[PDB]
Amino acid sequence: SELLVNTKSGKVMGTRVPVLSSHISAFLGIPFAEPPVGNMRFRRPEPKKPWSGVWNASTYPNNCQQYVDEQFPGFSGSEMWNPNREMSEDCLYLNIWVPSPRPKSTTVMVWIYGGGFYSGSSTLDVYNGKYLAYTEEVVLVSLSYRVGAFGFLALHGSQEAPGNVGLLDQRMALQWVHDNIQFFGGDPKTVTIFGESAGGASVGMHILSPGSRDLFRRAILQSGSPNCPWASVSVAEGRRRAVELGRNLNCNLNSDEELIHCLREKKPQELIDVEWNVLPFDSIFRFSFVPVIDGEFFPTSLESMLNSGNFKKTQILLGVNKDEGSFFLLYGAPGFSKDSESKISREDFMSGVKLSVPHANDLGLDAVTLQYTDWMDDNNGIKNRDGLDDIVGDHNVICPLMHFVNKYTKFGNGTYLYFFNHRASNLVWPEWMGVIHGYEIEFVFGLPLVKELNYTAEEEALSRRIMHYWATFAKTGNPNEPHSQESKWPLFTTKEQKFIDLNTEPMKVHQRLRVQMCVFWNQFLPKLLNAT
Amino acid sequence: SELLVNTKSGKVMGTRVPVLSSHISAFLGIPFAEPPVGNMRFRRPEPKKPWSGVWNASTYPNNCQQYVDEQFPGFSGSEMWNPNREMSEDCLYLNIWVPSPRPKSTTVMVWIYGGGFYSGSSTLDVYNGKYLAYTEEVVLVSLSYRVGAFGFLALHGSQEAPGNVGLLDQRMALQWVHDNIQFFGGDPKTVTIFGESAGGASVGMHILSPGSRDLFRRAILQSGSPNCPWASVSVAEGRRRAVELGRNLNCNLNSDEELIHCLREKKPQELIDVEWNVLPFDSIFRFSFVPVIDGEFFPTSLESMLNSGNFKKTQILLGVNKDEGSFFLLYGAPGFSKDSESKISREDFMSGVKLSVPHANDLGLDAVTLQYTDWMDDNNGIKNRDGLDDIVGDHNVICPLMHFVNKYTKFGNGTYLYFFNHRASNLVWPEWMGVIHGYEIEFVFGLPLVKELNYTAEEEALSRRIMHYWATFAKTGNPNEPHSQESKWPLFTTKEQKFIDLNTEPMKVHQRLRVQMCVFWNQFLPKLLNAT
Ligand SMILES: ONCc1nc(CCCCNc2c3c(nc4ccc(Cl)cc24)CCCC3)ccc1O
Ligand SMILES: ONCc1nc(CCCCNc2c3c(nc4ccc(Cl)cc24)CCCC3)ccc1O
Ligand SMILES: *[C@@H]1O[C@H](CO)[C@@H](O)[C@H](O)[C@H]1NC(C)=O
Ligand SMILES: *[C@@H]1O[C@H](CO)[C@@H](O)[C@H](O)[C@H]1NC(C)=O
Ligand SMILES: *[C@@H]1O[C@H](CO)[C@@H](O)[C@H](O)[C@H]1NC(C)=O
Ligand SMILES: *[C@@H]1O[C@H](CO)[C@@H](O)[C@H](O)[C@H]1NC(C)=O
Ligand SMILES: *[C@@H]1O[C@H](CO)[C@@H](O)[C@H](O)[C@H]1NC(C)=O
Ligand SMILES: *[C@@H]1O[C@H](CO)[C@@H](O)[C@H](O)[C@H]1NC(C)=O
Ligand SMILES: [Cl-]
Ligand SMILES: [Cl-]
Ligand SMILES: [Cl-]
Ligand SMILES: [Cl-]
Ligand SMILES: [Cl-]
Ligand SMILES: [Cl-]
Ligand SMILES: [Cl-]
Ligand SMILES: [Cl-]
Ligand SMILES: [Cl-]
Ligand SMILES: [Cl-]
Ligand SMILES: [Cl-]
Ligand SMILES: [Cl-]
């Protein structure tokens, strides 16, 4: 029977699963590592010891230990991103959706969730890969990885807490797909890794890290890049936050061994309670325990690796959403509220500026405000709100990615670039937030195809277009079907720099995505700060 | 008879002059100072010694000694600005157009010509005040003043060449109008001084200088301001250029007395030949001998005087032309030509940038180019040409004036602001130069009213509108006629910052003239240079 699969680690038994008037196979909660509990907290993951018997693979696993958003209790808009399973340090598991009948060798897609490296779950409703596996005849995997301190506490020079271990969690997941996906009908030679936000940053980090390049074929990055200012810290800064975390918990701080033994003693929620207190009073758009530039996982600085071609050469498909700053501001900036139009005075605009560029001389502040202020209309609350939203999105997401795109394309084997700007008809967040960070995911996973989810027919067609782009790219490295004559999504070349709009209108091709602002962010502003 | 007038200096006899199917009276070439010749070269002017007999005042005087443009021999576009009379150091004379019959007490307007303080003549065809005197029933004076080294050689601490003497030339002209214009039918209580470019800068400098404020009632500034970067130098920089001028002429350089005796010996054209060699290799948009911030004529820095209200409080009417950079670039920038469309490569744009900001760190260069570059279309030769034209005009004219306007309006008694953007139908310079610096003057002086000058009927109506604005402002301090209901030219207030367009279309009112660029020029760029 097709719900039984033998693997190099043991037998697993899945469940038949309905999906749009048909059925497919799902294997939920397969372990890919030893449970990182106890004195293994903060350590590199070990491979899952092989098991006897059949592993019930019919129900979702636990989610990892993480902060939980409570800003809007019961609000579906925020709670659709929270853990929907019991939380535990025993959380290193993957899930697989396999078409029925089982294929023999079809392309594989591995989903890497986001959440700023401090949160995330593979079991969210928007991450349910059954629609995509069934519609595009792919084998859909979603992995999990340790977040927060559990996955990214970095005491460099130590082997009990070296940092980046949540990245090694993902890597082991990919190694297990390389080794066992052939038994699920998947082609381990055509594995596409994809992910959004922190997951998009992860994908790019696996493109960069030599110990990861050989475990996948190509890559998709949504609203995230490895060079994003929130996505990595130095070895010094990682050690500082780790010691600062000990201070918060009354820890002996003389050695790394004593620091680590104390932290291993605390219950997980104790660590999470004080997690945000280690950030520098430098503030707001930054998360505590992120990957570290350690010399091992990342040989040198990300910028030098990028400049020298020191990265896997393949095909990539990536892009951004129109409004990437909205959540940063709602949750952390003064004067933004879920239930008002959040119009913003001149005063509040100037304070959000300062929050958006941590540690910038005053001359830099003027540079930013001069660039984003309409001085013919400088007291317009809506323009001030939109301007701040652009500042935050350009700085933290769009312009890092545009830098990555341009650096990568000089050496890679094909780049495709998209600008997603359709606001979902049924979005529960306020209108002023726009085409929000994170709200293309439901289209990539084909949720518009479910009528009771209350999407427009145009949104079903856009989701089908997008799913087909993603899967056709994963099978062949080109989103366009060969001899099917609809408008072509053109290659992104250093010369032309073309991209497309992704929305419900007929495709349009543009050039040089937000080049005006990103010249400012990627070339002018850092020069200004360097020379003052 | 009305061609004879007795003055506190002697009798003068003018000539009857035809003008648009009528006649008026003109008194050309009245001396207002002692001829500044010989050992009086470079000295403060002395009053004209009174004379016996009748002074023939029927023919134009000489023009002062000055550089003469020969870039386009015979080209009327350039030659209409050159001396049209024999040149001489004996050039301190004024000219008066008096309506017929002679008025008893009507308002007076004193024209101060431009020419970068290195050139200019009161006798140019475009400066012929007969049309304005006759049409608006004013008494029109035009003065003259020493230019070049003869008027602005500045060896501070010396009494034989203190600097600013060409400004004292103008002042003496105004003192003579104060004393004698009542005999020509002019009201010495309603004297309006006006002028363009260097003359506009002069007008503002007389508003600033205490020894000048009491000699006129109000003021008009066209395309010039006292704070313009080409309009003044420091005492140190004036001494440097003066000594450098001696080096060029094999002068003894040990003392000021010996420096000055040598320079007084050279024939005037010898000084003019080497005049441009004293500029710092710092270049292009600067003129050699300009006013100096000496502590006498200007008590303190122009910026501190402006900030503290240390200036005459009255009404002012001022404005700019759409394209102020065109001549700077044509004559001095590489890649601009009279007879091509002067489209400009990316390379040449970057070199014109460097020429437009003398002495700017490289970080400042990027600031300028980032602000004026369209990075979606950065190789457009026309946009690159227009961008450079805006850089030069904003920096050297528009944004200094906008700074002056805003500083003055806090303390003055009424400000009116215009943006002149009608290109004359019959302009002989190439189209790419646009609404050129200097080409509103012919409208202010009513030359469109002469049919054989080949202007459109709309240009006759615009000239009449403008002449009426200027004269009504000069009589009453408000350009609008009281109870005549046509659209009103609104006051310029710190809050609203309104101005009007001056062209052949019906008046329109706008707000915050080029505020985006002038925030960059007047606030951001100097801060950037200061802090690097
Ligand atoms: O974005 N501001 C958020 C914010 N929430 C709160 C509510 C309580 C938890 C603090 N947890 C934080 C969260 C997030 N970012 C943070 C950044 C800096 C710091 Cl000190 C804490 C953060 C973003 C994701 C959600 C939580 C208070 C202050 C505050 O600033
Ligand atoms: O604008 N460039 C002009 C320009 N003309 C020439 C032609 C010969 C005379 C030099 N006379 C000059 C004139 C003017 N500006 C100058 C600025 C710097 C210097 Cl060294 C000389 C200047 C502007 C008004 C007209 C003359 C050569 C080089 C040159 O640069
Ligand atoms: C695991 O499998 C059994 C039958 O194989 C099923 O009844 C059970 O519900 C599954 N586990 C849980 C926790 O429900
Ligand atoms: C990708 O590589 C192959 C062979 O290495 C080459 O022929 C092809 O043109 C490349 N495509 C791009 C877009 O670089
Ligand atoms: C679909 O729309 C109706 C109408 O407001 C709403 O009551 C219902 O809850 C929606 N369904 C879902 C699944 O949100
Ligand atoms: C000055 O006046 C006389 C008559 O008064 C006139 O003939 C003469 O032409 C004038 N001067 C010159 C230089 O022409
Ligand atoms: C000008 O001054 C007079 C009296 O000094 C004052 O009443 C009038 O309002 C002022 N006008 C402006 C525009 O400042
Ligand atoms: C007026 O236009 C004609 C036609 O080109 C021209 O020949 C003539 O010289 C012009 N007149 C003046 C004064 O420029
Ligand atoms: Cl199989
Ligand atoms: Cl514990
Ligand atoms: Cl870049
Ligand atoms: Cl849309
Ligand atoms: Cl919006
Ligand atoms: Cl670019
Ligand atoms: Cl009289
Ligand atoms: Cl001589
Ligand atoms: Cl200003
Ligand atoms: Cl017009
Ligand atoms: Cl133009
Ligand atoms: Cl302003």
Swiss-Prot record, chains A, B:
Subunit structure: Isoform H form is a homodimer; the asymmetric form is a disulfide-bonded oligomer composed of a collagenic subunit (Q) and a variable number of T catalytic subunits.
Catalytic activity entry: acetylcholine + H2O = choline + acetate + H(+)
InterPro entries, A to Z: AB_hydrolase_fold, AChE-related_enzymes, Acylcholinesterase_fish/snake, CarbesteraseB, Carboxylesterase_B_AS, Carboxylesterase_B_CS, Cholinesterase
Family according to the record: Belongs to the type-B carboxylesterase/lipase family.
Effect of mutating residue 197 to V: Loss of activity
Glycan attachment residues as annotated in the record: 56, 413, 454, 530
Keyword Glycoprotein in record: yes
Description of post-translational modifications: An interchain disulfide bond is present in what becomes position 593 of the T isoform.
Organs and tissues of expression: Found in the synapses and to a lower extent in extrajunctional areas of muscle and nerve, and on erythrocyte membranes.
Protein name: Acetylcholinesterase
Cystine pairs: 64-91, 251-262, 399-518
Effect of residue 197 to C: Loss of activity
Species of the source: Tetronarce californica (Pacific electric ray)
GO terms for cellular component: extracellular space; plasma membrane; side of membrane; synapse; synaptic cleft
Keyword Protease: no
Sorted UniProt keywords: Cell membrane, Disulfide bond, Glycoprotein, GPI-anchor, Hydrolase, Lipoprotein, Membrane, Neurotransmitter degradation, Serine esterase, Signal, Synapse
Protein activity control: Inhibited by substrate concentrations above 0.5 mM.
Active-site residues from the entry: 197 (acyl-ester intermediate), 324 (charge relay system), 437 (charge relay system)
Physiological role: Terminates signal transduction at the neuromuscular junction by rapid hydrolysis of the acetylcholine released into the synaptic cleft. May be involved in cell-cell interactions.
GO biological process, one term: acetylcholine catabolic process in synaptic cleft
Catalytic activity, EC: 3.1.1.7
GO molecular function: acetylcholinesterase activity
